[model samples]
Target: EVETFAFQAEIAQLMSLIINTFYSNKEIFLRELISNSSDALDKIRYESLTDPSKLDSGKELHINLIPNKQDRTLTIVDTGIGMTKADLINNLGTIAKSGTKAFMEALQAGADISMIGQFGVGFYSAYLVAEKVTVITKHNDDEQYAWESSAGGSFTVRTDTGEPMGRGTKVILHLKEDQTEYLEERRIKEIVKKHSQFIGYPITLFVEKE
Candidate 1:
């Protein structure tokens, strides 16, 4: 099967710019990812009204963040419509989409540039802090898939052995040594509020006792 495609040079340049600079306040990455999860939940909720059967599999749409300070790992999980293997590859590997070029052009043209949300490249923000990322997802329409990447040059997607999640997705971030600040409950909470307080779904974070 066709798993992935090459990105255009402009798209790669855009990715590099985003991964390097767009987030000077690293904490906002969590907000961006959660906002994305909220969007996914909204999508499924809206779809369910017309096709209630779509709600049968992955009905619960919420976000959970778990921090494993011992192992320096942070996991962000969501119960939204998950991506399939093809979705995993296409979404993660290439930036062959419309809004990026337009966004860059707008920046050059001195446009207000406030509507970047229309673009789908927000998920890649995870690379800013994580040394490794594991995305375990189960979709209502397809078999569960796991996508893993180090954000080097490639990512791998494979069928998952775990039981289906009923619905939704989870992203586990193995934070880099310098990025441990993200694991702090207070920091995570403030970041969420600052960036995604208006999101439609509930966002929860798991805190461990000191």
Candidate 2:
């Protein structure tokens, strides 16, 4: 049975605005995802100081980018706090946080919303390049789960049968024909440094040397 609901009417409108016009560069998706991974790592590190058990597994925080030339797939994985099936549905399915509202409020309050990274809207940016996306996650507090979606309509989440990593998340992007530029190692690496240098985590790419 499905545990998540569709986006609210206003959230749907906001998503349309973002996907259709607000973002200019499609490549920013990588930066956003990487930044999110960095934040996850930071969270665990902070939690570890008080609860050593939190660092028992997946404590090593680094970003791994693997490009599969054969399948035209790019996978970005991080060893951080992973999400449960319910967390995946709630976090990825709709806008529960008031990020959009806060953005508008910032404009009204004459505050700069440009630096706001707490917004949960970054995940949708994957649709700009991916025909299909899959996320494999193993959370310390929950069972491992896999979430899959195509930008078309619905997303699917199921219990993962594969061996789970100690902890953390992996996202695989199946690039669309027009978005093949993202599959290039040099280009992706440059984009990473440009947009994610201050993210406070290590980002590694498996590049094919010519």
Candidate 3:
């Protein structure tokens, strides 16, 4: 029960190339996601330096990972500068095509995949492993909103009346059948330690056993 949208902009050509030739490593998306999270927390911290009001919420800059057993979901919550509805449209809708295109070019030229953050679209790489990605964010200036997609080109964004994210973003990854490894605490910690030990913020995991 899902509707799909075609890729907008000239980026359609790029998508054809990347999806055809680009093979994103499954575990690699984790590093990119955490890297994006680090960038987000840093943005809010830098903003707070000039205007203390942003920190009035009293929420510390931290990220949390909660694993759900019944639902097969993994959630990453960050206390960073969340996005408004408009920001989500602009940022997510465009596919961050420029950075992604460059990153693909690098891959085609045999550059290291570890240099993913240099290109902003690394976040979309989450689709490599997720059945669907849902984002809930509450910005300093706007009510919370949700953005969702299964990486089927287009995505949908709408007003979210659910619990607010409180000055940052929460990413809920619905795992695909073959990707259940991410749903296990033991596997997640090992990957985090090996790849994300230096992602510029502390990342801890919470577990639920069925």
Candidate 4:
């Protein structure tokens, strides 16, 4: 059976607010997502240092921006620390909590952990331009899982059986009609350079050159 969960009443209201009027500038959604990816990369990098086997799979640490105009979707893929089934449920399903901060705090006594992202709410910014969001992630320690939501007060998590995924996350945003402008190669490239130019890892935009 496909598992589903309902967002708390207040979380649903907050998401609706985000979709309707949260940010005056909408393209920052890309920036937020990229920053989140950066944090994921940092987690794996730090973890790999202590347990070399974490990177034994040899997946390069990087991010990719893929825009599909025909499908009206923009996908951000990161070869970084991914989520376990529990993380998908607690982090993505809940609102008002930063998974990065919690992770850092859990490891604070051992070492200093720094991340670029602040608020867990940053993720809902995808609703700013998307009709739906799907995340497929595989962590080094856990089996693959998929989390999907339309920002319609509910979401589902299931065992992913599509294409195989490395140890990282793939977020696919089904863009709203007016927001399809983000699918342009130049626009995506500009957004990356303008907002995330200094991210530590390589961020590539897939574009079939004209």
Per-candidate local distance difference test:
0.72, 0.73, 0.74, 0.80
**Top candidate when judged by lDDT against the true structure:** 4
lDDT of 4 by residue, 163-204 (tens): 978789999999989898899998998888899999999999
* Candidate 2 deviant stretches above 4 angstroms: 1-5, 14-24, 93-97, 101-118, 208-210
Candidate 4: 10-residue stretch with minimal lDDT: 111-120
The Cα RMSD of model 1 versus the native structure comes to: 3.2
User: What ranking emerges by TM-score with the best candidate at the front?
Assistant: 3, 4, 1, 2
Candidate with the larger lDDT of 1 and 3 = 3
Q: Which segments of candidate 4 are over 4 A away from where they belong?
A: 93-117
TM-score of 3: 0.87
lDDT of 1 by residue, 1-210 (tens): 213344456555655665566455566567767877887787788888899898888566788889889988888888776776676766642344665776777778774323344455666667678878888888776888788766545566777887668878888889989899888999888887787888777778899978
TM-scores of the models, in the order given = 0.83, 0.82, 0.87, 0.86
Instruction: Show the lowest summed lDDT stretch of 10 residues, model 1.
Output: 1-10
Query: What is the alpha-carbon lDDT for the whole of candidate 3?
Result: 0.74
lDDT of 3 by residue, 1-210 (tens): 333445555344444443444464667767777777788899889999999899876458888888886787888888888887777777552346677678778878987655656777666656656778898888887887888876546777877878855688888988877778888888889888888887777787987856
Candidates by lDDT, descending order? 4, 3, 2, 1
**Cα error, candidate 1, residue 94 (Å):** 8.7
Please give the distance, in angstroms, between residue 134's alpha carbon in candidate 1 and its true position after superposition.
1.8
Error of 2 at 11 (Å): 4.3
